[PDB]
Structure formats: C-alpha cells, structure tokens
Write a protein that binds this ligand. Structure first.
Ligand code: GTP
Ligand code: MG
Lengths: 38, 702, 68, 74, 104, 61
C-alpha cells in the first residue's frame, strides 16, 4: 500500500559517523556560524 | 497540375517488404472458395475446372490443383461452410479468395466472419462472386440488389473490388461467358506479399496416407499413435530439409518431421524445361569439417579449448626476427523507397546468384526445398482418430514453427470486443484464439494500466475500445494480429455473431505482476475532533501494527493516516484525519493483492472428433450457471439506487406563494448569470489572444 | 465535445448507504462534505473575530445609548 | 435454420450522437427555427398581433410609470 | 508545399512517442515518430484521441497530413505540424467511429 | 513478552519498508518527470526549428 509521511529517521552508527565527520571537518575549517557582538 | 503530379505518385511508396517467391518453380496460388452453405461452391468449382481443362468433375472432394495459362498453376479448395475450424485456417493459408454471396438473400454471417478473419489475419486478394440472380424480371430490382451489394461489399473490403455476377445454372455448370471473364482475371491475378506467409513455411495437404504396418495395427488392436505420410505442396519460406523441424498441422497440434522427400512434380513446367492438365488427388573442406568422426587437428593436418580467448602465437623472438622487415604486408597496407527496394532486391539477387551452385548443398542441405516442391512428409506418433475419422472435405494446413514459438508461458496482448458482438467479454471466460497457427481455448485476464503506473485486473472488458489482456498460451512472436471466437459448436449459434475479440499480440513474458484493488473497510464508533477510533476492519493489533502509517480516506474525500492500535478493544484502533468526520462515514484503505493468471491451455483438436464440428470446449460462466441453475450472485447492499380569519389565511397563502416564486425566479436568474459570465470569459480570452496576435503581426513588418 | 463518444461520457450513479449501518443512515459524499466544511470554516472565522474584539475590548467605551 | 444479418451490420453505422427528427427534413428544421424566432421577437419589440380581439379587457400585463420606450432626438 | 509539393505523404511509424505519459489524452502522449518515405526522414506526427492512438503499432504504413491549429490551446505542444489522417489503407476517423476495420 | 517482541518487530519492519519504498517512489517519479520533460522539449525545439524555417519560406511568397 501507500503511506503518508516518511517515518522517524532512526539513528544509526552510519548517520552519527556522517554527523561527526561533518562537524569535525567544519571545526577543522573553524567555520562556525555564531552571532557577533553587534 | 504539378500539385497533382506530386500528389498521385505517393500511391507508390509503401513499407518495404520481402517476398521469397522465387522465379523458378512458383507454387499454385491457393484460392479458397468459401461462403454460405448451400449456394455456390461446388458448381462454381465444376464450372472453373470445366472451363480450365475442358473436363468435368463429378463428386469433387478435397483440394484440386488445376493448370491455367502457360507458366503457373493454381489450387482450389471447397471450404466447408459450417465450421470456423476450417474457415479460420483457410483464411490463414489462402492467397486469393473468390467469395460467394447470394443476391436473393443479402449478405450472410459466414462470409461476414470470413471477411473479418481475413481482415485481421492478413488480407488476401478478395474477389466477390454474387450468384443466385433468379431475382425477378424487374431489372430495376436486379440493379438495386447489385448496387446495394456492391456498395456494402466495397465498404467491407477495399473500395473498388471486382464483384462478378452470375446468373442461374445451366445443367450443373455456370454461364461460360461469366466463367471466362472470371478466369481471365484470376489468370492476371497479381498477388502481394504478406508477413505471415513470408515468415513461415506453410503447406496445404492434398494426399494423406498411413504407411503404418497392417500386422502391427492388427496385433496392437486400434491403440497406436501411427505414422502418417502427408503428400503435400509447400508454399512460402523454405521448410528446412533436416529432420527434426517442429511443424504444426492444424487442428491436432504440433509434431516434428521424421523424413521428407522431394517428388516428381505432378504439374506442368513449360515444355522447353520439360524437354531440355488437371491433377485432382484425394479423389573438400566443407565435408572435412562436417564429417563427425575425425578430430579437428587431424582434420587440419589431413587438409594441409575456447575458454582461453586469446588467439594463437609463435615464439616472440622468432616472429620478431622474421618481421625485422615488414614489407610483406605492404600488399595490404597503404528516392528513399526505390533505394530500399533496390537494397532488398539486390540482396535477393545476390542470394540467388550464390544459390545457383552445386545441388546437394545448395538445394537440400543449406536451404531445403525453397518453394513449389511436391514433398512427402512423415510423422510418427500421430494419434489414431485423425486417420480413423479423416474427412476429405476438411483442409489440412501445416506451418512450421520458428524457434521462439514452441515455448509456453504468458503473453500480454491488446484486445477489443469485436464491434458487432452483442455482448461484452467478462474476464476469466474462456475463448478460442487463432494466435498464429495454433487455435486454442484459453482463459484470458483483461487488464488496463490505470494511467500507466500499475496493471490492475478489470472485471470486464471495455465496451468499445481496447484494453490489455494476459493469458497462458503458445508464445508467438510480437506484433501479430489474432481473432478470438466464442463458442464454436453449431448447436448454439442462433442468430448472433460469433467472432468476439480482435486484437494484436505485442509482448510476451514468463511471469506477469497484476493486481486487483481490494479496499479494507471499517467504521468509526467514537468520533472526536480531528481524530477517530475506527472499528472492525482489523481483527488484531498485529494487523494494525503492520499497517500503521497508511493513507486512508473516507467516502467524503478526506484523507488521513492511521497511527496506532488501541489496546483493550483488540480490533479497534486510532487514526488522525483532515477534520472531524461524521459518524455515518466509511473509512477505506487502498491495497493491491497480486492475482495470477490461470495456466489452462487446450487446443481445439478439431479434426479428431467423429462429428468434425460441435466441439464443446469449456462452456461460458453464464451457461454453466444456467446449466446447474444457480442465480447470478447479486450483492444486496451493492445495487445502485435513486438517492435523495378567511381574509388573513388568504393573505398568508398569497404571500407565501409569491415570495417563494420570486425566490426561485431570482436563483434561476443567478444560475444563468453564471453561464453568461463564463461565456463572456471565453469571449474575452479569445479576443485578447487574437489582438495580441494582431499587435505583433503589426510589428513583424520591421 | 471535441472528439469523445457518448458512451465515453455516460453517467456514473452513486452508491447508497449500507443497510448494515442504516440506523445512522445517509452516507455523506464529497459535495455534502464541502458544504459542511466551508460552513464550519466561516463559523470559526466569525467566532475568532469576536474573540479578538473581546481580547481587545477597550474597557472605557461609552455612547448615549447605554443608559438602560 | 438459415442465418441472416441484422440491422446494424447491414447499415454499418455506429457510435454516433443522438441526432434529431427535426434535423432529418430540412424544410422542417427551417420551420421550427422560424416559429421559435417568430416567438423570440415578442421579447425585443412588441409586434402587431391582430389588435383588439375581444372586448377591451385592459392592457392585461402591467403598465409602469417610470419607463419611456421612445427614441429621442439627441 | 510542406514536403515538396504534395498535401499528404505515406510514412512508416517508428514507435509510439510517449506511452509512459501518465496523464491520459495529453500532447506528449499523442505523438508518433513517422519515417517519411518521400525523402526518407523523421518527423513527429500528432494522432488525435489517445483512445484511438492504439490502432497504429509499428510500420503501419501511415498517411500523414498537416495540422493547422485554429487558435491557442491549454497544454498543446508546438512543433508537431503533422496529424494522422489515414492508417494502412483506411481512415482512422472511420476506425475510431468503428465503421470500417483496420486490415493487416 | 513474545507478543511484545513480535509487535515491536513487525512495526520496525513496517517503518523500514515504509522508508525504503517511499524514497524509491519519489526517485522513480523524479526520473519520470526528467524523461518526460526531456522528450517534450526536444520534440518542441527540434521540430520548431524546421517549423520556423518553413514559415519563413512560406511567408515570403
Ligand atoms: N436457380 C439457381 N440455382 C442455383 C444457383 N446457384 C446454385 N444453385 C442451386 O444450388 C444447388 C446447390 O449447388 P452447390 O452450390 O454446388 O452446392 P454446394 O456448393 O456443394 O454447397 P453445399 O452443399 O452446402 O456444400 C444447385 O443444385 C443449384 O441448383 C443459381 O445461380 N441459380
Ligand atoms: Mg458442397
């Protein structure tokens, strides 16, 4: 049959590995987008 | 008139097709006298043989091969006018059809069924013979019947066909002037190529013998599947001479050939090729390679392991030293339709010019009895009832099989109820098919792609247009027409038509996925706002736990997923919707259960019965229901329905009439004001697009 | 009608309400749904505009008509 | 026990819209178009229909005050 | 004039262009790839009424004619200049109103 | 405990095959849109070229 929506995205070791190398490549660039004193 | 000069020479340009009718021994062009019972056939045959060989023929039976003219001869066949089991394969084999109508009766449905079978299976050269003009002295009515028959005939077949009229019979034979002006036409015949008779080796039988041992049948006792010689005359593509070819003769099923043999020709060639007449029956290195005994290396050493792909090689140093100088290899080193016709005709010419070579290879073991060779065939294991109740009236056609059309399995065709059949075709109601050479009763399933995403099962064919269909059966090649008959027995024909389903096979396979939409159905019983507990569609929480997440919709058109099973009332569960449902609604899933086609297959096996007709195969569903007298299964909640003081009293009556009259007059004026608004919308849209065309046509002069 | 048949534009009758649930009968199709739903939307919108004026009541209004 | 052909296979028509008995004979369709259009222009003008037939039973369908159907000279 | 001087040209259909268009009776569903024979080329013809699209299958020796739109449509594609008027001897208007029969 | 196990496992199965067939359906729908759009604008432009050429050749004369 057919279903309405995509289900909850289950957290697998592959998706936490992609999130961790995303964030460690990001802070190896040190490209964190915070606010500024302005 | 240059426009007409460039417009009438588009009659020439057609699809390029190939012929394979060689100009050395052309076969007798099988013509096929068919039509109604009673009128015509035997007297027309007697007249044609009496005018073509000056000798009569009393009690004619089976196929004649008479000679007409110098070069080539032809073949007659009185087809019986009581069975489609002869009519169908006569229309599959024939090349001309002189077709009988009787002008004191109008048309007739046997020639109607024959013309439709010919129109689908490939049009032969049709030629109408209107007989039985004993109409009246009123030559106005004679001209009227001939005019109406000619116009109806030119609509049914190509417009402009010849319709020869015959008067009454003068002592057994027809008027000889009309037989003269018919015989001159069928001498100037000029046939055309067709794909089936230019793709399959086909033969009409005209002699039929049983060369099985009389002591063997007398000691086995009428049980054996005997061996049978068909002495016959092949047409079309060359039937390959090596024994082992699968050949289906009609109405018993296929066999394999055992041995075939070329005979003396019982019909005239020209007399110069004779030196340097009605026949009416039923009344080095190459042999070094192909020698089996010797090994290949002993073969090459008498003349002078391929998983390893690489070609052979010598010693690297040896051929490098040989080819330190390489000048030994210096001798090597340094309109559209007439175009296509020239291409295929030059192909056929070089084919013939390298065929004209030594005779055992180039006639009977490289290509095998091209066309026009009186050959005897034998088959062992031919069943008993064929020879026990063989009838000389019925034709015995036989076509070879291509390597693809012996396999079985499903086939997906396109279908359409034949537009004069008075009743539509329910699915899983069996019908006879003339798919190729085989004719067989099978159970189809009519499907359609619902806007080309999935193939669901219809419970009925559409009423006038096509639909897909799938059925078990012999896998013919794609892109071929086929007719489908209902009941073939002449005990139930009555007054109605017989052909049911024309169509075209386009695609074969071995397994088809095909669904049927079943709808799960439940009811709500505690309706909240925006959610509802729905009831008695699932017997258990395990079913609900599989189906959690599905789109359902009510009958009102509101969607909504289902979420989770309720706990204690174990059938019921909880769903969320668009907004609040009424209690009087029905929740509906959507679901597909894959149905599978039935593997039934039964050929007609026509000419094995004692009766030669009345082949009751499987009955229709309606008539077995009427046979064991069950009623048709109506569903009582499924039937449609047509859904849904005197002065003061007088003044109240007048006011309550007048305000309601003016109310509905006002709403009618508003209703028609809506259509006046839509009409002005269409008018302004057309005017605006016309003016925005004109305002740039005013600027394209720049 | 450009290139269609009358059998191509034949009538589709609508199925009834089941007799198994005939106590709360009159199955309610799509036109009756939209005539319910637009009415409910209009009632909710007028309820929310008077609720908005109630949440901005401005408690110092006065006219000559408020003496009795 | 002899077959025949029926009407639709003899005539060889089919799958047409329902046409009109008024549309058959052109003299009739050019009559039933006129006497409708004869009765149409009792709604754009007021044509002469014989005059005072019975006794004068009044104008019988309404006279209104604020309406002048007189073309005026600019 | 649009093909030499003739008003009609016999042609061979390659394949039914756009069988996988989901919307029934649409422009991209009602196209065929005709091989014109008079000069041996490709062209894209526009058979009316997808319900009678499925008469023509493959090398059905089809006979084309021009199209000539008398306005502007909703979702009609431009580029198709040719409509099918006769297929394999008969006229597919007569075939779609099921008078004659397609011969093969 | 076995009822809890089988219900937990069948609903994990439902969510898993849900996710995979729904991304498969969206992928095939997007590739269908790509193929249909490609053939419709190639039949638009490649034929409109000779259409405008013939209209330029006709409107002169
Ligand atoms: N008056 C008249 N009688 C005809 C004519 N044609 C055929 N008949 C009669 O029809 C009878 C049947 O002759 P055939 O047509 O040869 O019979 P058949 O061809 O064997 O037909 P079947 O017996 O059904 O197989 C003949 O005896 C004729 O008397 C005709 O043109 N005029
Ligand atoms: Mg006879």
């Amino acid at each position: 049959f057919d279903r309405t929506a995509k289900p909850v995205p289950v957290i697998t070791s592959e998706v936490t590995e992609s999130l961790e190398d995303m964030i460690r490549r990001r802070i190896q660039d040190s490209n964190f987008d915070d606010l500024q004193r302005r | 008139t240059m426009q007409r000069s460039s417009d009438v020479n588009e009659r020439k340009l057609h699809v390029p097709m190939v012929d394979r009718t060689p100009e050395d021994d052309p076969p007798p062009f099988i013509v096929a006298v068919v039509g109604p019972p009673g009128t015509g056939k035997t007297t027309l045959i007697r007249s044609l043989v009496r005018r073509m060989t000056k000798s009569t023929l009393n009690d004619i039976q089976g196929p004649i091969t008479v000679v007409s003219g110098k070069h080539r001869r032809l073949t007659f066949l009185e087809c019986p006018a009581d069975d489609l089991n002869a009519m169908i394969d006569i229309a599959k084999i024939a090349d001309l059809v002189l077709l009988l109508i009787d002008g004191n009766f109008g048309f007739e449905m046997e020639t109607m069924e024959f013309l439709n079978i010919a129109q689908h299976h490939g049009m032969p050269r049709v030629l109408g013979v209107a007989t039985h003009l004993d109409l009246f002295k009123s030559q106005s009515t004679l001209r009227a019947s001939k005019k109406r028959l000619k116009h109806r005939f030119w609509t049914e077949v190509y417009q402009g066909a010849k319709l020869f009229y015959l008067s009454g019979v003068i002592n057994g034979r027809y008027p000889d002037r009309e037989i003269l002006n018919l015989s001159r036409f069928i001498s100037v015949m000029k046939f055309r190529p067709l794909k089936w008779r230019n793709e399959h080796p086909y033969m009409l039988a005209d002699r039929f013998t049983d060369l099985t041992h009389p002591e063997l049948i007398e000691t086995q006792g009428l049980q054996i599947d005997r061996k049978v010689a068909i002495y016959g005359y092949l047409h079309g593509t060359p039937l390959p001479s090596a024994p082992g070819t699968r050949v289906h003769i009609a109405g018993v099923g296929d066999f394999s050939v055992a041995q075939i043999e070329k005979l003396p020709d019982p019909c005239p060639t020209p007399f110069y090729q004779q030196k340097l007449l009605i026949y009416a029956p039923m009344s080095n290195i190459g042999k070094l390679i192909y020698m089996d005994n010797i090994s290949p290396e002993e073969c090459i050493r008498r003349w002078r392991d391929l998983e390893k792909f690489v070609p052979y090689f010598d010693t690297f140093e040896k051929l490098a030293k040989k080819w330190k100088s390489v000048d030994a290899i210096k001798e090597r080193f340094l309109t559209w339709y007439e175009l296509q016709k020239a291409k295929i005709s030059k192909q056929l010419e070089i084919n013939n010019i390298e065929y004209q070579e030594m005779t055992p290879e180039q006639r009977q073991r490289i290509e095998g009895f091209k066309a026009g060779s009186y050959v005897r065939i034998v088959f062992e294991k031919v069943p008993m009832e064929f020879v026990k109740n063989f009838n000389p009236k019925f034709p015995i056609v036989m076509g070879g099989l291509l390597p693809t059309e012996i396999k079985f399995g499903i086939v997906k065709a396109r279908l359409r109820r034949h537009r004069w059949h008075k009743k539509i075709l329910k699915t899983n109601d069996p019908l006879v098919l003339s798919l190729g050479w085989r004719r067989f009763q099978t159970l189809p399933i009519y499907t359609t792609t619902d806007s080309r995403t999935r193939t669901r099962m219809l419970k009925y064919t559409p009423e006038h247009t096509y639909c897909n269909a799938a059925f078990y059966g012999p896998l013919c090649s794609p892109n071929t027409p086929f007719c489908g008959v209902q009941i073939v027995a002449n005990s139930d024909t009555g007054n109605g038509f017989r052909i049911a389903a024309t169509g075209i096979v386009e695609e074969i396979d071995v397994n088809i996925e095909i669904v049927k939409k079943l709808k799960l159905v439940g009811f709500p019983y505690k309706i909240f706002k925006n959610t509802a507990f729905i009831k008695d569609m699932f017997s258990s929480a395990m079913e609900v736990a599989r189906f959690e997440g599905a789109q359902i919709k009510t009958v009102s058109g509101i969607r909504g997923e289902i979420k989770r099973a309720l706990s204690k009332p174990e059938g019921h569960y909880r769903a969320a919707f668009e907004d609040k449902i009424l209690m009087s609604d029905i929740v509906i899933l959507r679901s597909w259960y894959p149905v599978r086609v039935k593997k039934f297959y039964n050929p007609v096996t026509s000419l094995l019965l004692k009766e030669k007709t009345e082949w009751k195969g499987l009955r229709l569903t309606g008539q077995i229901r009427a046979a064991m007298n069950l009623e048709t299964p109506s569903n009582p909640d499924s039937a449609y329905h047509k859904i849904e003081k005197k002065a003061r009293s007088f003044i109240q009556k007048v006011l309550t009439i007048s305000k309601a009259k003016d109310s509905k007059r006002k709403e009618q004026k508003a209703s028609q004001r809506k259509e006046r608004l839509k009409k002005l919308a269409k008018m302004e849209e057309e005017k605006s697009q016309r003016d925005k065309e004109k305002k740039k046509e005013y600027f394209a002069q720049n | 009608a450009k290139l269609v048949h009358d059998v191509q534009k034949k009538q589709h009758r609508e199925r009834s309400q089941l007799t198994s649930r005939s106590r709360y009968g009159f199955l309610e199709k799509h036109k009756d749904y939209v005539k319910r739903a637009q009415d409910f939307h209009r009632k909710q919108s007028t309820l929310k505009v008077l609720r908005e004026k109630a949440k901005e009541r401005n408690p110092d209004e006065y006219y000559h008509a408020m003496h009795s | 026990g002899k077959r025949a052909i029926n009407y639709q296979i003899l005539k060889n028509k089919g799958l047409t819209p329902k046409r009109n008995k008024d549309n058959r004979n052109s003299r009739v369709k050019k009559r039933k178009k006129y006497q409708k259009a004869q009765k149409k222009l009792k709604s754009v003008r007021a044509v002469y229909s014989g005059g005072q037939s019975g006794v004068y039973e009044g104008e019988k369908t309404g006279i209104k005050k604020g309406l002048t159907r007189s073309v005026k000279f600019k | 004039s649009p093909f030499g001087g003739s008003s009609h040209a016999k042609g061979i259909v390659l394949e039914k262009l756009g069988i996988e268009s989901k919307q029934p009776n649409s422009a991209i569903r009602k196209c065929v790839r005709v091989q014109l024979i008079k000069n041996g080329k490709k062209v894209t013809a526009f058979v009316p009424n997808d319900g009678c699209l499925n008469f023509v299958d493959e090398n059905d020796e089809v006979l084309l004619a021009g199209f000539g739109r008398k306005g502007k449509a909703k979702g009609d594609i431009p580029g198709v200049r040719f409509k099918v008027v006769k297929v394999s001897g008969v006229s597919l208007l007569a075939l779609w109103k099921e008078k004659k029969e397609k011969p093969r | 405990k076995e009822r809890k196990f089988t219900m937990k496992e069948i609903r994990k199965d439902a969510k898993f095959e849900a996710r995979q067939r729904i991304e498969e359906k969206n992928k095939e729908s997007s590739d269908y849109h790509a193929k249909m759009a490609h053939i419709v604008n190639t039949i638009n432009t490649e034929e409109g070229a000779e259409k405008n050429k013939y209209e330029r050749e006709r409107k002169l004369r």
